């Protein structure tokens, strides 16, 4: 019945005060601490850059006696794989990665389920017929979200166009704000983002447009603009993983949880959403949870007109994992 506390560390690419992505991972850590109490001792490091700095931070946490380390950014993938080889008695969990080892697992959300529902609402609320996406880097997570936003919108209005702008960072509130201003200048009036700040929401509110929270309810930053949010609940996953390491049941695997598992939840609808739109949103949400609809159910074509998925089929897990193609109706912004 007696066992020393499990030392668990979290490595963040951003600040806990982003009120988005890192905030939600850190709420997951705090949920793990509440659920497991004295059986776990957690620590975290914020604002860890990619490459040599990340490797040095992850090594130091492994050297300090942490037995379970979560690296919560795509950009920590190669540093995590190198430190895992050097620390074969430490369990490593890497968010959104594709590299596994005996002591390295990977985990991610199916947030694109929520992004699909956002696109349904964006189609109902847009006046220009142009929706906007602030992207970080063209990795499969982000391209799945761009496509899911577009397909969700197209389920309501097949003529919808999605304009994408890239900021080449996950988190920079000044760059995110400039990117949101550019999308609105180029005719987008309902915005979503894969970056980590509420900057896009604040710009939407200032310009009288709409946007969506990402990873947390961001309505306090922009009560008029915030239609809803795709909330990320990491707490149950972090709890289960820490429990597995303590109990000796942990094994390397690829974990993907969505709305059915409670990792992805939608915030309440803005009062501006009319009853016809709200009703459709609740019906599609129920269908998403039950698996009666899937964001990448066929038929799908890419932007060259190639068939990716036939009607009555679903996109295979391999194509989801490596997604680097766009559906018809996705375009870039004019640069400068």
Ligand X SMILES: Nc1nc2[nH]cnc2c(=O)[nH]1
Task: Kindly list the residues in this chain that would bind ligand EMC in the complex (CB under 6 A).
Answer: 111, 115, 145, 192, 194, 214, 230
Closest Cα partner for 247 from 31, 29, 28, 39?
A: 39
- If the CB atoms of residues 174 and 334 are measured against ligand X, the closer one turns out to be 174
CA-to-CA distance for 280 and 278, rounded, in angstroms?
6
Query: Of ligand X, ligand EMC, none, which one does residue 80 interact with (CB within 5 to 8 Å by kind)?
Result: none
- If the CB atoms of residues 71 and 147 are measured against ligand EMC, the closer one turns out to be 147
- Write the interaction track for ligand X spanning residues 20-59; mark x where CB under 6 A is met and - where it is not: -x--------------------------------------
3-state secondary structure of 42: strand
- If the CB atoms of residues 55 and 215 are measured against ligand EMC, the closer one turns out to be 215
| Residue 224 DSSP symbol | T
Main-chain phi, psi angles of 6, to 5 degrees: -75, 120
Main-chain phi, psi angles of 122, to 5 degrees: -60, -40
Calculate the CA 54 to chain-centre distance: 21
Sign of the CA dihedral with 1 first, then 102, 94, and 235 last: negative
- If the CB atoms of residues 75 and 235 are measured against ligand X, the closer one turns out to be 75
- Work out how close the CB of 194 gets to ligand EMC at its nearest, in angstroms, rounded to a whole number: 5
90-129 residues in contact with ligand X (CB under 6 A) are 95-96
Cβ–Cβ under 8 Å, residues 87 and 103: yes
Query: Of ligand EMC, ligand X, none, which one does residue 13 interact with (CB within 5 to 8 Å by kind)?
Result: ligand X
CA-to-CA distance for 26 and 72, rounded, in angstroms?
10
Q: How many residues does the chain have?
A: 336
- Work out how close the CB of 111 gets to ligand X at its nearest, in angstroms, rounded to a whole number: 8
Q: Which stretch binds ligand X (CB under 6 A): 72-80, 173-181, 288-296, 312-320?
A: 72-80
CA-to-CA distance for 66 and 68, rounded, in angstroms?
6
Cβ–Cβ under 8 Å, residues 230 and 210: no
Query: Of ligand X, ligand EMC, none, which one does residue 14 interact with (CB within 5 to 8 Å by kind)?
Result: ligand X
Identified binder of ligand X from the candidate list 13, 36, 273, 330, rule CB under 6 A: 13
Calculate the CA 229 to chain-centre distance: 11
276 is in an annotated binding site: no
Query: Of ligand X, ligand EMC, none, which one does residue 145 interact with (CB within 5 to 8 Å by kind)?
Result: ligand EMC
170 is in an annotated binding site: yes
- Work out how close the CB of 282 gets to ligand X at its nearest, in angstroms, rounded to a whole number: 26
* Strand partners for 43: 9
137-176 residues in contact with ligand X (CB under 6 A) are 141, 170-171
3-state secondary structure of 36: helix
Burial class (CB in 10 A: 0-12, 13-18, 19+), 17: exposed
- Work out how close the CB of 96 gets to ligand X at its nearest, in angstroms, rounded to a whole number: 5
Query: Of ligand EMC, ligand X, none, which one does residue 196 interact with (CB within 5 to 8 Å by kind)?
Result: ligand X
3-state secondary structure of 109: strand
Residue with tokens 């972090």: 238
For residue 212, state whether it binds ligand X (rule: CB under 6 A). Answer: no
50 is in an annotated binding site: no
For residue 61, state whether it binds ligand X (rule: CB under 6 A). Answer: no
Closest Cα partner for 146 from 36, 261, 302, 29?
A: 302
Query: Of ligand X, ligand EMC, none, which one does residue 205 interact with (CB within 5 to 8 Å by kind)?
Result: none
Helices (H), 195-312: 199-207, 235-247, 275-290
- Residue stretches of the annotated binding site for guanine: 21, 73-74, 141, 170, 196
- Binding positions for Ca(2+) are 196, 214-215
Task: Indicate the annotated binding residues.
Answer: 21, 73-74, 141, 170, 196, 214-215
Instruction: Enumerate binding residues for ligand X (CB under 6 A).
Output: 13-14, 21, 73-75, 95-96, 141, 170-171, 194, 196
């Amino acid at each position: 019945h007696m066992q020393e506390p499990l030392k668990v560390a979290f490595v963040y690419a951003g600040p806990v005060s982003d009120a988005g992505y890192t905030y939600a991972h850190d709420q997951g850590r705090l949920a793990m601490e509440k659920n497991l109490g004295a059986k776990v001792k957690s620590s975290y490091v914020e604002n860890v850059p990619e490459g040599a700095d990340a490797e040095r931070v992850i090594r130091k946490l492994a050297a300090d006696g942490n037995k379970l380390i979560f690296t919560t950014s795509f950009g920590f993938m190669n540093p995590t794989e190198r430190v895992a080889k050097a620390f074969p008695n430490v369990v490593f969990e890497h968010a959104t990665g594709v590299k596994l080892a005996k002591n390295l697992g990977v985990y991610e959300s199916r947030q694109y389920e929520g992004t699909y529902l956002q696109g349904v609402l964006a189609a109902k609320m847009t006046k220009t017929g142009v929706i906007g996406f602030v992207g970080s880097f063209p990795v499969p997570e982000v391209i799945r979200n761009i496509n899911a936003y577009t397909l969700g919108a197209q389920s309501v209005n097949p003529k919808i166009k999605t304009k994408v702008i890239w900021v080449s960072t996950w988190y920079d509130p000044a760059k995110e704000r400039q990117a949101a201003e550019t999308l609105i200048a180029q005719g987008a009036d309902v915005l979503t983002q894969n970056t980590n700040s509420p900057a896009t929401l604040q710009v939407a509110q200032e310009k009288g447009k709409y946007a969506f929270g990402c990873d947390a309810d961001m309505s306090k930053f922009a009560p008029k603009a915030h239609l809803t949010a795709s909330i990320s609940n990491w707490g149950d996953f972090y709890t289960k993983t820490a429990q597995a390491v303590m109990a000796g049941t942990w094994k390397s695997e690829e974990v993907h949880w969505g709305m059915a598992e409670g990792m992805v939840k939608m915030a309440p609808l803005n009062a501006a959403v009319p009853p016809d739109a709200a009703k459709l949103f609740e019906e599609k949400k129920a269908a998403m949870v039950s698996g009666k609809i899937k964001p990448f159910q066929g038929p799908l074509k890419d932007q060259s007109g190639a068939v990716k998925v036939a009607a009555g089929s679903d996109l295979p897990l391999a194509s989801l994992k490596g997604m680097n193609w766009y559906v018809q109706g996705v375009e870039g912004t004019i640069p400068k």
